[PDB]
Amino acid sequence: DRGVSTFSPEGRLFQVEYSLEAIKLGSTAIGIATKEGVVLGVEKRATSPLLESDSIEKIVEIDRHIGCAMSGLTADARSMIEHARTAAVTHNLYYDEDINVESLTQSVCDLALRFGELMSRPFGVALLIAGHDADDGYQLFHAEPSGTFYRYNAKAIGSGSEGAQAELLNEWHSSLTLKEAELLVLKILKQVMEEKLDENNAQLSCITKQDGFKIYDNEKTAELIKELKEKEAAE
């Protein structure tokens, strides 16, 4: 065989590149950042109809001001979320304040390359980290198993990412309202999803300065889905 921390001739780490292929097989997750808030949405993708879809937890709270969506080997994300929550709470204990979204993301990304012959392999999951702080306002970050993170105005990850990202390139502008962003996530999810989008197989969430991180009810999302279908038929 070969070392886990081996470089390829092109100057990339084999294991990190292979984990990126696992993330492409994962379910779609989309995030959009506005001046009124950040929206996070995911495809649940139940493997069977007997599976109770509400138990599928792919959007997750880290703190009141920070939320998180995932895509890939979702089991790998548990210890990442655990670390993120501890980092957020620990900082509040040491400094009597909220921790910056960027500093949280950096803390999570420090775990990424702690593998070799430390854990035995990289994480096989990508994260979208969305939050708010007083200094830099509403933010969205894409955290990869390479240990790298980019800030985004909008970002899609998962199986339908490259098609959804191209759609986000055209639709995003710096004056989007929160409601406009909500509909946009639903619209783009419906386009890349295999099965027909409804309140049971898709989930929305947002983070605002005022109310913090909230996962939407199935009743609330259902009305936004109905509002979306009516607006597309109206021209």
């Binding site: 470089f7 100057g11 780490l13 070799g116 894409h142 980019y150 985004y152 970002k155």
Partner: protein, 231 residues
């Protein structure tokens, strides 16, 4: 071929392929330039984005009030090495009340990178660094390679198409070395140097990254509207 499975293996011609593959990661990285006069030292870096919706990856990192570097290659490896430099600079201050010499900073990075090239299990660092600083012997510029080799220079560049800026600085050597007591002109020379490595893209306001340190100037980084002056 059969001798590139790990860093502990020599090839029949005496080469370390894992170290060479790590060197290759730097070549894929975005271009960054370093140059100095007798009074100041300047870093200029071209930042890279994922797409139009993404931010531009930050290339420059501060290590102390009098020292800092720019990166090209694996960014997390730069974070580890810069953190180590922050600690070593800090140890020097707390224990000896002494600012760490830029030369010692280079020696310490060399030795840390070397240990990762002689033992089983580990891997070489996959990043190159340009360290600038001002200490008791004036301005300094260093080039770090993950083979362990550290080199002191008047000017240099690393990353993709770095040969263009490196040739330019080799011609301009006599001019920019004597830009003493004039920060803006030394930066202008650095911005003109990195321009020789551009293809199809030009320097914009959220694309360019500049840093400076000198006689009466702490290590500071300029981004955004603060670099509009130099376009």
């Amino acid at each position: 071929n059969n001798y590139d499975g790990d860093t502990v293996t020599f090839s029949p011609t005496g080469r370390l392929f894992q170290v060479e593959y790590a060197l290759e990661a730097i070549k894929q990285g975005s271009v960054t330039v370093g140059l100095r006069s007798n009074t100041h030292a300047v870093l200029v870096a071209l930042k890279r984005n994922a797409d139009e919706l993404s931010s531009y990856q930050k290339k420059i990192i501060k290590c102390d009030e009098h020292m800092g570097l720019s990166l090209a290659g694996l960014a997390p490896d730069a974070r580890v090495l810069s953190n180590y430099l922050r600690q070593q600079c800090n140890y020097s201050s707390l224990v000896f009340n002494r600012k760490l010499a830029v030369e010692r900073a280079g020696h310490l990075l060399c030795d840390k990178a070397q240990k990762n090239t002689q033992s089983y299990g580990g891997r070489p660092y996959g990043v190159g660094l340009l360290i600038i600083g001002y200490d008791k012997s004036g301005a300094h510029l260093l080039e770090f390679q993950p083979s362990g080799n550290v080199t002191e220079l008047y000017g240099t560049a690393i990353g993709a198409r770095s040969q263009g800026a490196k040739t330019y600085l080799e011609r301009t050597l006599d001019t920019f070395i004597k830009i003493d007591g004039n920060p803006d002109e030394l930066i202008k020379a650095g911005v003109e140097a990195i321009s020789q490595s551009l293809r199809d893209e030009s320097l914009t306001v959220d694309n360019l990254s500049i840093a400076i340190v000198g006689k009466d100037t702490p290590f500071t980084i300029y981004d955004g509207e603060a670099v509009a002056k130099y376009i």
